[PDB]
Design a protein around this nucleic acid. Structure first.
Ligand code: MG
Ligand code: MG
Ligand code: MG
Ligand code: MG
Ligand code: MG
Ligand code: MG
Ligand code: MG
Ligand code: MG
Ligand code: MG
Ligand code: MG
Ligand code: MG
Ligand code: MG
Ligand code: MG
Ligand code: MG
Ligand code: MG
Ligand code: MG
Ligand code: MG
Ligand code: MG
Ligand code: MG
Ligand code: ZN
Lengths: 157, 141, 112, 67, 100, 53, 145, 100, 143
RNA sequence: UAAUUGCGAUAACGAACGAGACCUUAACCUACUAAAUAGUGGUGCUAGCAUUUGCUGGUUAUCCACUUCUUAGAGGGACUAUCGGUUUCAAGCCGAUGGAAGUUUGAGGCAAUAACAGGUCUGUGAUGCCCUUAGACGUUCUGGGCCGCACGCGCGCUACACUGACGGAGCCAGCGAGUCUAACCUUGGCCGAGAGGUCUUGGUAAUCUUGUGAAACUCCGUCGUGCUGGGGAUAGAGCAUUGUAAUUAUUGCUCUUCAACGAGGAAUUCCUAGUAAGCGCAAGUCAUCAGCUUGCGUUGAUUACGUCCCUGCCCUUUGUACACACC
RNA sequence: UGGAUGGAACGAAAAA
């Protein structure tokens, strides 16, 4: 019994919270988005990831964990909420996937130029049509600066 | 049934529908005679469609209008546009177009907006100023 | 305008529209000055006036004439306008418009 | 201005080059067949292309044209 | 940074108020138009409101020494008997002309 | 004690905060979403708000 | 459409309540010159005095001037609805008054000295000669004297 | 029997798909229906400063959300009633079914 | 040929009906008349002060003859005006309520209007007898 | 040409981004699909005036019919179309006709390479380093300050009156917002001069507020060139509302008090059509408080359709003792 | 078959 205006914006923040939570949770599992589908008697959630078996966990321990977390914090009755995890197609064609891989490679000490050209090469090999990676900050110096690595060609406007 | 047409006139944001049917020659504006078009200056301005062609072309027909929206000046131009378009529509679909040719030419030759709506539309207001073009004020020092 | 036309009719029984068009014809400055030069030293130089500007200037000088005269005065703007119009139409040297008209003419000729 | 950009000029050049025993001096019919024999993403572009194509065949009717 | 004396001095100088005027403010005639009428006025109205191509509230106050209200009430009185005809009776502007 | 949080917070700026950064300044309460503007712009696309004109 | 000539009984500027009211203006607005008497009060009192508002002040019958004055000095006795009066619940006798020409400044001064004597914030502010209603003074009221 | 079905989606394409197949199902079942009434869409606007902090040129930025709402009336037996709301569920479109 | 209120000029009809109500003088008088402002937005009481209640009744009477149902809220909205908030910019203020309320009660007691279902006042059977006959007299006054 | 936008010329050929292209919005559709949460006509019941048929209203389950006005979805429509001038004779330009629309139709959204040692650690559970960490620079509670005033400056709001003020009447918009573990937006009735109070009602919304009966505006009056019935700063007295709590008055209402201002010096801001300017309304902050901002509509001008003189910008040539680059 | 010269205009702390 809510006005449709607030109902829709509530759905907006609904999608927002889950998306931000998952990006903070399933980083090491190659999370690449989420989709929400509302039906009578059930609201359904689809995860887009790469390491799907890791998202599920042993006997689905992890996926059941996430189902409980979202249940308890969103005030849902049992059976009204379900999560599936599904492998993303064209893992190279996913900016959120790439940025996360870049993050992990840097955290493991990999060099800037080698990491970035690793990514742009991977995405080019994966059948893309234009890519660009920009890195900014302290790079082996005190004065900060950026470097651009790009292949193919893109659009801006 | 009886012969009848219905048209509309428009202005900035004012609209005026016009019911025209064969009758005894009465002109009404939302339940009142044409002679009570409140502005006491545009009186002739709404008389124009009647006077340009002559009152005789009204002895056999009835015109009634309903006008809403806009302001008084825009409203008047709505009534006059509605009357003119209803008139030509009636002459189009019941009378022969012989009369049409003279009445249309006389109308356009005297004023365009009798039959063609004015295309001037308001421009949106933009930040950094009080109007579409104006800015607030720059003070360098 | 309706009022000032009535005024121009009760006085000066000729057609008021003819009166005003005469006033316009008689109040259009036919020569004027402007800045002319080729650099750091440009000067007031005389120049002829387009007919369209002649009319536009006339209409201005008349309307400002009325507005200033009727300002802070018992006389209404409607009758003050007609006073200006009929004076300029006949040619009086008492209307404001003629003051500026011949003042511009005299300055232009002295600075030809 | 009314300048026609190269993506229009080149496309029209293509149509004239390979579709002469075809679309004629009428803008309406050329419009109605441009989408039939070519793929254009937007109608405004399609209309511009057809307009220039007509302008070209108007040139064609008075001698040849360079290129 | 100004010294902790210069600013004080400036403030003192500033408190030289009276307000710059940049104006002239020349006086005027200060008219004293009559407010209540009398016999020697009344007959004056009666004898010279004719021979006027135009009369109005302003016309009878710039020449005569009567006020606006006296003018309007006079025009209302005069036209009742009929000396000057009405041709436009809008408010804020009355237009009347001599009968002939 | 019973005075640690005694003061009422039934209204005013302190009664509410951004649901992300928990700031008190610059809230957007319109449509009852309660997010400060600068956090809002980041999540605008995810929420579904877009620029058209 | 009526123009009555006159009678020689007209008088120019006259005096009452220690105030030299102008003549030859309408009575309701002439009374506005009375210190402490405004537009609304003058209008109401003249209607309670049954005087037609249209006559100029100088052209007026003397025998009802004192009737008007009697009205305004104790208005509450003449079905004045008691919320017109400018001094209500005052400070000592608790009844309803309406101060007039010479009394207005006296009641202002003694109120100010009352607040001074009691050392209230408002009285202190009045003594210092500043604003009391809580306005900003950073950029306004510069050349106040 | 005199049922109201309302659609309150955000995306036009999927909204139209839902409206299309509902009316198609009703037509193929040969039911008397009141055509899809297309209520005017509502636009949700927010205007904020672009800059996080306070300096710079005063630039303003506005976002929108378009909500499209539609409604339909049916006269339908109970057996079909349940299966319309049983089918034609696809995401981004909120559906509301009610009697009276 | 048949006439109605909408066949006569708005100003004249009101002036006619108010002058009508004058000589019977039986409508009503609140008693607190010629003391009030008719609105917080006004600055001076009515200059007439010899009535203007009959004018108020005439206007509200034809206004109800115009619309279907009207209440005090709409009367305040209609009769309000732009108040001059001193130095701050002007602003709309709806007119006083007790005035129009007592006017409506007066028209009730005369039987020109009555309480209508789903809120407001409707013009009465014998009420429109009066309004139309006044309009007829007003129009034939030109002869 | 608005455009390294094009015609072309050519030790260059072939390409990419930006512009353009693109998307949204405002204008045309008596053509398609329809619509008691939009209308219209007719038919019933019914009110008034004339009667001779008629005119103007009211009326939900009286039905019937339609989609012009309103709403959208899919589409169409302008591409400078046709004609006449003008140029290697090309890209183009000008005028006229037709047309809802002929300055890329109007307005925006997005918007390249390289930079600034521009702003923000007070938006962030983003942060490196430094400091502090329990009589803490953590957190919380009470009371003050952010407004404080001898002065200087910036954005604005009121006005210096008659193209006006005041009082009665007349009577017209658009963009929007609205309550669930709640008190929102309020119609209607009653009390009160007013602010406001009280009893009910509809709405989670094209249906209810709301036709937002707005204001400026018109029509009759009073005033009358008088710092005046202009102007409402300052101040006194009383009545309410919001909020635990208003005292250096939150705001509203009533009465009284009635100051500068007579068109504003050097200087300086914005602007080419529904635009400037006048006029209000909705939303943001919000327990209460607009002189602010973001949008919306009503009334609607004058003066260009040009130039590089002032202030600057783009391209080419040339000089340079400059390179944190004329500061 | 052409044609205009044309007023005044000082300075900017050290290092990167
Ligand atoms: Mg404007
Ligand atoms: Mg005047
Ligand atoms: Mg009014
Ligand atoms: Mg103003
Ligand atoms: Mg009926
Ligand atoms: Mg040609
Ligand atoms: Mg554009
Ligand atoms: Mg930051
Ligand atoms: Mg501050
Ligand atoms: Mg600013
Ligand atoms: Mg409306
Ligand atoms: Mg005043
Ligand atoms: Mg607000
Ligand atoms: Mg602010
Ligand atoms: Mg040299
Ligand atoms: Mg060097
Ligand atoms: Mg130097
Ligand atoms: Mg030196
Ligand atoms: Mg030196
Ligand atoms: Zn935040």
């Amino acid at each position: 019994l809510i006005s449709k205006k607030r109902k829709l914006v509530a759905d907006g923040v609904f999608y927002a919270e889950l998306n931000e939570f998952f990006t903070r949770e399933l980083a090491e599992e190659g999370y690449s988005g989420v989709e929400v589908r509302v039906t009578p008697t059930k609201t359904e959630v689809i995860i887009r990831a790469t390491r799907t078996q890791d998202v599920l966990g042993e006997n689905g321990r992890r996926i059941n964990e996430l189902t409980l977390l979202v249940q308890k914090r969103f005030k849902y009755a049992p059976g009204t909420i379900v999560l599936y995890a599904e492998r993303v197609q064209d893992r190279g064609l996913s900016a959120v996937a790439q940025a996360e891989s870049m993050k992990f490679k840097l955290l493991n000490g990999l060099a800037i130029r080698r990491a970035a050209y690793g990514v742009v090469r991977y995405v080019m090999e994966s059948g893309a049509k234009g890519c660009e990676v920009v890195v900014s900050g302290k790079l082996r110096a005190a004065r900060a600066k950026a470097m651009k690595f790009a292949d193919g060609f893109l659009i801006h406007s | 049934a009886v012969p009848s047409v219905q048209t509309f006139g428009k202005k900035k944001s004012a609209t005026a529908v016009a019911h025209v049917k064969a009758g005894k020659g009465l002109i009404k504006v939302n339940g009142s005679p044409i002679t009570l078009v409140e502005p006491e200056i545009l009186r002739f301005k709404v008389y124009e469609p009647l006077l340009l062609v002559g009152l005789d072309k009204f002895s056999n027909i009835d015109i009634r209008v309903r006008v809403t929206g806009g302001g008084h000046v825009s409203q008047v131009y709505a009534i006059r546009q509605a009357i003119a378009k209803g008139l030509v529509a009636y002459h189009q679909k019941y009378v022969d177009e012989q009369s049409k040719n003279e009445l249309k030419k006389a109308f356009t030759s005297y004023d365009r907006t009798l039959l063609i709506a004015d295309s001037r539309r308001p421009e949106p207001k933009k930040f950094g100023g009080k109007g579409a073009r104006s800015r607030f004020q720059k003070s360098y020092r | 305008i309706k009022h000032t036309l009535d005024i121009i009719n009760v006085l000066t029984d000729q057609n008021p529209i003819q009166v005003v068009v005469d006033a316009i014809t008689n109040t259009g400055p036919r020569e004027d000055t402007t800045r002319v030069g080729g650099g750091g030293a440009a000067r007031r130089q005389a120049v002829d006036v387009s007919p369209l500007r002649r009319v536009n200037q006339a209409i201005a000088l008349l309307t400002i004439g009325a507005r200033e005269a009727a300002f802070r005065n018992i006389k209404t703007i409607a009758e003050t306008l007609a006073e200006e119009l009929i004076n300029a139409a006949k040619g009086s040297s008492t209307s404001y418009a003629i003051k500026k008209k011949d003042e511009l003419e005299r300055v232009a000729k002295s600075n030809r | 201005g009314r300048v026609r950009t190269k993506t229009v000029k080149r496309a029209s050049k293509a149509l004239i080059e390979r579709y002469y025993p075809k679309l004629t001096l009428d803008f309406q019919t050329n419009k109605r067949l441009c989408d039939e024999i070519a793929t254009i993403q937007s109608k405004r572009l399609r209309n511009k292309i057809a307009g220039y194509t007509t302008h070209l065949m108007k040139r064609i009717q008075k001698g040849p044209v360079r290129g | 940074q100004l010294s902790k004396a210069a600013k004080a001095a400036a403030a003192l100088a500033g408190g030289k108020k009276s307000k710059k005027k940049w104006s002239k403010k020349s006086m005027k005639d200060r008219a004293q138009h009559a407010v209540i009428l009398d016999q020697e006025k009344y007959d004056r109205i009666l004898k010279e409101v004719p021979t006027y191509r135009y009369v109005s509230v302003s016309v009878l106050v710039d020449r005569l020494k009567i006020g606006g209200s006296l003018a309007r009430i006079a025009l209302r009185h005069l036209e009742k008997e009929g000396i000057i005809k009405p041709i436009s009776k809008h408010s804020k502007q009355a237009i009347y002309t001599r009968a002939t | 004690e019973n005075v640690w949080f005694s003061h009422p917070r039934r209204y005013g700026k302190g009664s509410r905060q951004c649901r992300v950064c928990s700031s008190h300044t610059g809230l957007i309460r319109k449509y009852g979403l309660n997010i400060c503007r600068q956090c809002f712009r980041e999540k605008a696309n995810d929420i579904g708000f877009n620029k058209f004109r | 459409s009526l123009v009555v000539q006159e009678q020689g009984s007209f008088q120019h500027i006259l005096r009452l309540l220690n105030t030299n009211v102008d003549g030859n203006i309408k009575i309701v607005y002439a009374l506005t010159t009375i210190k402490g008497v405004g537009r609304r009060y003058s209008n109401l009192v003249c209607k309670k005095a049954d005087v037609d508002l249209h006559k100029r002040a100088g052209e007026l019958t003397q025998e009802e001037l004192e009737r008007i004055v009697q009205i305004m000095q104790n208005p509450t006795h003449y079905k004045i609805p008691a919320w017109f009066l400018n001094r209500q619940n005052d400070i000592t006798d608790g009844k309803d008054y309406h101060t007039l020409a010479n009394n207005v400044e006296s009641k202002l001064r003694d109120d100010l000295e009352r607040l001074k004597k009691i050392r209230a914030h408002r009285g202190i502010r009045h003594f210092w000669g500043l604003r009391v209603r809580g306005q900003h003074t950073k950029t306004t009221g510069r050349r106040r004297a | 029997i005199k049922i109201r079905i309302t659609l309150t989606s955000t995306k036009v394409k999927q909204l139209e798909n839902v409206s299309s197949n509902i009316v198609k199902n009703a037509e193929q079942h040969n039911l008397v229906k009141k055509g899809p009434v297309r209520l005017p869409t509502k636009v949700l606007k927010i205007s904020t400063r672009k800059t996080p902090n306070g300096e710079g040129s005063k630039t303003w930025e506005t976002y929108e959300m378009r909500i499209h709402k539609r409604y339909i009336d049916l006269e339908a037996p109970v057996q079909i009633v349940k299966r319309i709301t049983q089918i034609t569920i696809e995401p981004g479109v909120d559906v509301e079914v009610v009697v009276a | 040929p048949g006439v109605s209120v909408r066949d006569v000029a708005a100003q004249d009809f009101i002036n006619a009906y108010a002058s009508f109500l004058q000589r019977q003088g039986k409508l009503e008088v609140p008693g607190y008349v010629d003391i009030v402002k008719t609105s917080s937005g006004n600055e001076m009481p009515p200059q007439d002060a010899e009535g203007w209640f009959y004018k108020r009744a005439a206007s509200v009477a034809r206004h109800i003859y115009m619309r279907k149902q009207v209440g005090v809220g709409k009367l305040n909205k209609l009769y309000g005006g732009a108040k001059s908030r001193g130095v701050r910019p002007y602003k709309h203020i709806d007119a006083s309520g007790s005035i129009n309320r007592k006017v409506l009660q007066a028209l009730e007691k005369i039987g020109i209007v009555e309480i209508s279902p789903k809120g407001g006042r409707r013009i009465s059977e014998n009420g429109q007898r009066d309004l139309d006959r006044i309009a007829a007299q007003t129009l034939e006054e030109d002869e």
